[PDB]
Every structure is written in structure tokens, then in C-alpha cells.
Symmetry: C3
Subunit: 351 residues, 3 copies
Amino acid sequence: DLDTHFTQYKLARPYIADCPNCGHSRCDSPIAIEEVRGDAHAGVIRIQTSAMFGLKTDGVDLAYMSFMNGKTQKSIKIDNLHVRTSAPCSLVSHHGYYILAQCPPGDTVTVGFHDGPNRHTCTVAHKVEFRPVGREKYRHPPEHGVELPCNRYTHKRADQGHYVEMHQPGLVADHSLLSIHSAKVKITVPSGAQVKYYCKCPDVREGITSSDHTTTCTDVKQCRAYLIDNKKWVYNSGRLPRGEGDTFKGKLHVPFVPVKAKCIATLAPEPLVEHKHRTLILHLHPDHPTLLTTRSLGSDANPTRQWIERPTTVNFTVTGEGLEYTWGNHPPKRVWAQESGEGNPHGWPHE
Amino acid sequence: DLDTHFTQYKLARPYIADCPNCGHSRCDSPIAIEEVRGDAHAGVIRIQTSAMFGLKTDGVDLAYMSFMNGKTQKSIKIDNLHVRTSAPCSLVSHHGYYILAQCPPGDTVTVGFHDGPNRHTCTVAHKVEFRPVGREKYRHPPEHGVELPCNRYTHKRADQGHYVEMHQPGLVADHSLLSIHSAKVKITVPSGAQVKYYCKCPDVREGITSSDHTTTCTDVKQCRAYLIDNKKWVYNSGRLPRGEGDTFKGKLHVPFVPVKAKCIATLAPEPLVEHKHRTLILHLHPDHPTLLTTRSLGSDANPTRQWIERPTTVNFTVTGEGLEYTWGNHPPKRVWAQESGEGNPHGWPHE
Amino acid sequence: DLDTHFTQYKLARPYIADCPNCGHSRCDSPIAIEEVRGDAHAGVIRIQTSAMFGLKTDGVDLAYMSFMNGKTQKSIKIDNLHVRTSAPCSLVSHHGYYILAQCPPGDTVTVGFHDGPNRHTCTVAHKVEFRPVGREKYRHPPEHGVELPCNRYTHKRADQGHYVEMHQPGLVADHSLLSIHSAKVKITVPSGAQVKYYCKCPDVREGITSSDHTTTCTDVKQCRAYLIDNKKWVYNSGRLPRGEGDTFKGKLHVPFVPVKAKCIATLAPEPLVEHKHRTLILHLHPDHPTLLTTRSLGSDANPTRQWIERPTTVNFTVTGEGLEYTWGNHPPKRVWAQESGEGNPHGWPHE
């Protein structure tokens, strides 16, 4: 699709905000990454840029990229963005501030394209794993092993399953906003917005203050270029401060929700589950860390816990009423006993 | 280039194979890496892409690029290709479906060109190693220290020294293979291949044959999309099944065999072969794991194992006929007995 | 981009060199890295290429790039250069043989402009400080917690605040230097040179000489293809060797000196100091390892060492003569008590 929820698209407009670490003396780049979410366990990561790529703010094409340079957009191709995490990602779809991308897992996320007088890249921390939700935990994107139940992302961008605060935005600097009132620096709107203000010099800065500007300060770089977008409510980033005198309502959804089904997944290479006489001999040979653990079945209790991330023949003494064997977030298996070494006389010879 | 082994080279077609980690952790692309060979003690890896870069079907240049879009080639410049491991390689030569490339070490192999309807890249896990010939343990050799007789793959092409069976390529998915002959589903060849075609419906399915054809059962998913090669050979892969019945012989060399060369190689910063009375004290100053070991030259064996990556004066009690000392896979020392003490007089007023 | 201290620029020519490491099979790059000055506690790196970017031989601009192709320059744009570390840097300026780039933090340095079918980049290892003198260490100066002195390299190049010993353009490899004068081995200069010389055959077998060329043996490979430019004064690289005779030593500045700035710097998130009676409980939990040590003050010494990155309540027994608490190589804070632990309003001693 291109159009999935004009909830986000129409009612949001890009903005440019500071990147938390960029190492160009800490560049400002419109790819300022907040909310990395490798919270789908299926190879896929949702990333948030501070700019609203997707549809420009209109009806046409996920294949554009509209960030702010100035107070103005810069409506160019989607593919001029480069999300990456470890190895280069492959886009799945963009919607709003949010992109879904097939990426390697990563402790960080590292996005970047040339913009400004620099190379304008952006990086941020967020712990990602494509862990099974259970007694296993995994790294790399699926390419092996059995499927078993964990999170996975929606390819659907209409989701009202959660919503992120976007109600009354505020500033980011865009001193392209800030014109001059013929000696003193003058607040202006990006494309509409109730834009609040102050300078180092005295000015009113509580209430709506789009009709107030500072009449005592000349320097542009000591004043509050604002975007309270109250008709195109933008993502509320940490690198986008809020107003304090205004209130608008415009809480706006997130397109991509990690949902649980049969995620494309992993299963740590096949364990040998064999029952001998009241004993599960278990040759084990995993890849990703598997918590093997048990539930000795019957009147019995006897659990065992040991993370197995190393090949080990272990044993679990199966009782008459059974033992259970829980090779990670692979579903619990079960074993009864009375033996399984074969041959307890308890009959009458005649054969 | 060389056509002295047009056995593989000329008679090689672009081969299409599924990608297991790509754009949703899965995509359709020609490329998909089998038989990665970090088995050399060097720095170079022999790789098989599924795609047949090299020539086209002619004889000229390893610097063209023929991958599959359709069942047909796309014989273009090699400039859109990127062989990489976990970092960009430098090509050495391509011959057949096989590329030799001096690559940094890497857990994965990552190939990709955007020439498809999608991102059209491919990544897969495959084990690469380099280590010292005997003794020492390193992965990829340092940039300093001695050069010494590693295995390494050729600087050239069209060779032989070993051969892997490449006896009949067969069926791979691609519905360009299985077009429709205006009612019934129709097998096609890459450039000419003897196709032992059939479908689920009863037919002959063994023999050296392009006399096996089934049209009785119709659907591309109910029939065997084949390139049974025997004069257009590709290297055999897991994503390249063969016809169920008899092999069409086609055992084919590797033109990228391991040869001796002077690798940048392994030897951690210089040892000191010190001696006192019937003892090799050995002041050692390595920066890398060097398997030191010694051998007391008597009928005593005196084995040793000790990794030295720590600067240490160690000792080995030299027996009465010397000791030898084997400082990694850097050349053996040898040491006589008698005693020393480093030029100490033992008495010297002459009789 | 402008050039003012023609001390380095004019009195120089780029000197061809060979990269120390550039994969298993090295690329020859005349931008070979010596003298990394990345030991700034900021994340910024000054690199020395063996190439003399700057001028072409003109009067203006560091915006060009004169590296060596042959013995001759190749005077093109500097904008093809990419220093990078953990992500792309932004070049700041080149001056002399030295390029400065505002980088993300990184221990090592990796410089490169691609040329030819070879990588043509150059990288090197170099021990870097990311701490001031005294306590703690970082491998990446925090951007979390308080900022306190960080060395950093300039945002400029006009700067002569330190000086390295310099000589002159020594010898360089390349047979472009030595033609044959039809029976004699013939020096060819692209810059003018007083050439210190000898051949395999006897003549002046020191080559402590002014300008000479030994003709007793003739062929470039058995003769001294050296270009000692004595009308130029350049920095001594390791990938620049020099003649065996005269040096023209002359202390000549470095364009880049480590200075303090608004760098992300060397203190991780601030301690949470708690105080009970004569004892500091301290839950501590930064984002980066802080070498904590204390000095329970007075004639009591009490040093402590513990790397703090963990979320752990630790203790340092405040004496009655105070304590100091030394959160890294931050200057010690201090705290005395005899009663803390949330007070005892007296109606009785400690009521």
C-alpha cells in the first residue's frame, strides 16, 4: 500500500532535530533516531526517524522522503535514506516517522545519508534481539531452525494497536523560521503552527505566544524557533521539546506493532531426546542459548534449570509418572517412565 | 580469459537459488552462496556464487557478470557486483561459477547488486577460517612478523589439483524455466542442456535423457523446472537438486586450488633463545598466541604445550644431548647440551 | 579551505608510500598512515598521510589532494577522501602531509579515497588515549554524564602550537625516478633533488654525499632510486625513507595540536552519593566504566579501586576528618559526617 492511515500521514509533517551522536561535532540531521524497536523477533526492526518519510504529507508514494531542510520540506526519493543496523538493511515499508526494515539485530542502529555541509549520519542505542519469547534467546535474522512462538512485525501500517504521544508538539530549532521584525528576531510558523517563543531577552512565553515575539533581542541564535503542529501533529521526540502554555490533542498511532504468532524463528540445532531406563539421556548441541529445564511429572515436581549453549550430554531422571523436558521456547516435551532399557520379566515364558 | 578449462568455464550458465536472509529474511534472487572455503591458512577465500560471473557463454573476460533474471542471463559489467564477507573483498579471478577473492575474514558472506525488481542482494552464513600451518593459533595473520608456507588459493585461474563432483545440476525454481507451450507446461534450457524433464504424472525419470518429458500433469509447481547440465555445468548445491534418477557425469575440477605462497603470516614478536646450565630459559615477548613447545632431544619426549601471548621467561630443562624449541610455526630452534651460563668460565688456567 | 603556512605546503611534494595493511594482499597507497594523533580524549583524529594534500603547487586551498601517481603528483579534489572510524568522519582540513577530520570516537584510524579496481585506502593501528592523566579509561568518551576536559584536534589548520622534527623529502620507491641514460643509471627529478646515491657495484659505499649518481652498476633495481629534495622540508614518515647522506633537519610545526573543546568527554553519569553514619552507601550505575577510588581523608589514606559500570551499592567509610570520593579522573569531591542516616532531632542524644 501507499495509504494505510491518513491518521499519521496527513496529520504529521517532517521536522529536523538533533542527532544524539553523529561525530561531525554532533550534526543535526533529519534522521535523528528515536525509538529503535527490534521488538519483533523475526529479522525485522522498526526504526523511527525524526522526519516523516512515507507520503510527503499527502496521498502519493511511500517512495518519497520528506525531511525538513529549512522550515520547508525536501521531498526526494526513499532510497536516498539508508537504514542499517549492522549489515545494510532492506526497507520493507515506511509510514509516518516509522520505517519497517529487514535488518540484522543490533545493540545500536546506524542510519546515514549525505545532507548538509557534512555527511549527516545518525546513530542511537537500543537493545535488540530476535529472542524467542520463552526459555530461548536469539541473535541473527531467521535462516535456520524450526518456528516456535515469538514476536514478529506487521506489514500493516494502519495499526491502532498502540499510539505514541504526538499531542501538542513543540520546538526543534529551525532558525529559518526566525525572521527579523526589522531589528528584533521574529517567530514564524513552519506551514501553520501555534509557535511559542522567548529569547534570552524578556518576552511572554506562557499562553499562546504565536502572536507574541521578542521585541528586545536581535540575535536569532538565542531564541525559540517552534513548531507546535496542531494540525499536523508531529512525533514527540526527546530531541523535539514541547510547549508549556498551549494544549492540543492529536495523539497519533504507530503503524508497526510486534505481534505474536508463529514468528519466522530459530530452534537451536536438534537435541537428542531418548529415554533409557527411567532416564532421559540427552545429547544436546545448540547454537543460540537454550534454557533447558524440566518438570518432573506426577506427584513429583523436580525441575532442573541449566542454560545449554554448549554441546553437553546431560541427563534428567524420568520418574514413573514422567518428566518433562523443555528445550527452550520449543514447546515442553514429555517422557513417562517405567524403564525404556527394555526387558523386565513380569510374564509367563511360553515363547 | 583462459579457456584451457572451458570444461567448467565456457560451459557454465547463471544459476538461480533462494536467498535465506535478504529483505524479509528471504527474497528471490539468483545469488545465494554455497561452498565458501576459508580452509586456506591465508587470507583468501574461494566462494561459489550461484550466479555465474565470468564470461557470458563465450570465453572472454572474468570481468563480466551474468546472473539470472528469468532463466536467461543478464550479461553485464561486474561493477554492480559486490562480493563481500563482512567487509568488501578484492577480486582475484572468476572462473565458471566460482570466484576467488581476497576477503577479510567473516562469519557470513554478503553479495548483492540492485538489478532485480527488489533490493536483490543476498546474504547467508558460511564459515571462513585462516589459521597457522600447525603450532600457533590465529585467525587472520598479522601485518608483521615472518612470512611462512601457508595454504592460499591461486593468484591465477583455470587450474586443477582437486575436483569436486559437479555431476548433473538439475532442478531449481524459476518459472521462466517452466513456461507454457500454449497449453502445457514447457521445460527450457539455459543455453542448451539435456533436460530429463517430468511431472508428478507417470513418466520415465531415469536414463541419460532429454527423452524424459511430461506434459500430462500441468502446473509449474507440479513439474520439474530443470537445467540438467552436462554441457553448461554449474557447481552442485543444496538449492540445486538433481533429477531423482541416474547422474549425468560431470565431475569437474576447482580452478582455484590451494597452492603454497608467501602469506603475510604468523609469528608473534621475536623470541630470545637464552640458556643457562642445562636449561633453556626463554625470554619471550609475543603479542599473539604462539604455541611454544619444546622437545628434550634425549630419548625423553618432553612434550610441551603452552600458549605464549604473555611476555614470559619460561624454562625447559634441557637434557644431556640438547633440547629443541619450536616457537610457533616459525622455524624450529635446536640447542645442544653441555651447560652454559652465558659464557661463564668453568675453569681456564691451562695445564 | 585555504593554505597560509607555505612552510609545509610549498616546500613539499607528495611522497609515494605503501600502506601497512590493506587486506591480506596489500593495496599500494601513497596515503600510507604514519603518526596517528587520535589520542585526543574527544573522538577526533588527525592522521598523517604520506601524501601532501593541500596545494597542487599553487598558492591556495587545501581543497585539493596531491597524492603520488608515478613520481609525479595527481592534483585533484580532497573531497573523495573519507576518514571514518565507527562511522564516517567529516574532513576538517589538510595541511602539509596531515589531514584532520572530526570523527566519531575510535581507537584506530582508517583514511581512504578509492582509486583503481583496488581499494586504495589506508588504515593503521595506534594506541589512543580517551582519558586525561590520572584515573579511569574510556574507549569512547561518554556523551552521558558531565563534560570535563577532553583533548580534541582543531576545527582549523592554521596552528603551530607544537612542532615535530622534520627533514626533507627523502627517497621513495618507484622506477619513475630512475631511467637509464643509455649506459648510466639516470636520476630524474620532478621537484629538483640533491641525490644521495650508490649502486650494488663499488663507488661511494656509504652514500654520504651531496648529489651524485653511481654509474658503476646500472639498472634501477641495483641502484638507489632516491629523490632527496633539498629545496623542500617535509615530515618524516616511516613509509617515506631518506638518503644515506645529508639531512636538512629543521623543526617545523604540526598544523594540528590537541586542544580542549566542546567534545563529548571523559566522565560517565554522576555518582548517587548517599551518606549514613561514617559510611557512604553509593548506588552507582553509569553508562561507561568509571575507575572509582576514594581517599577517606585526613591522615587516613584508604585508596580504593573498582571499575564502576555495574548497578551496585558500594561503600567508602567516611572518617572524622572527611572523605573524598573520586569518580574517575574527575577532581575528588568530598563529604564528611558523623551522623547521616536521616537525622535524630535531640530530646536525648540521637533521639
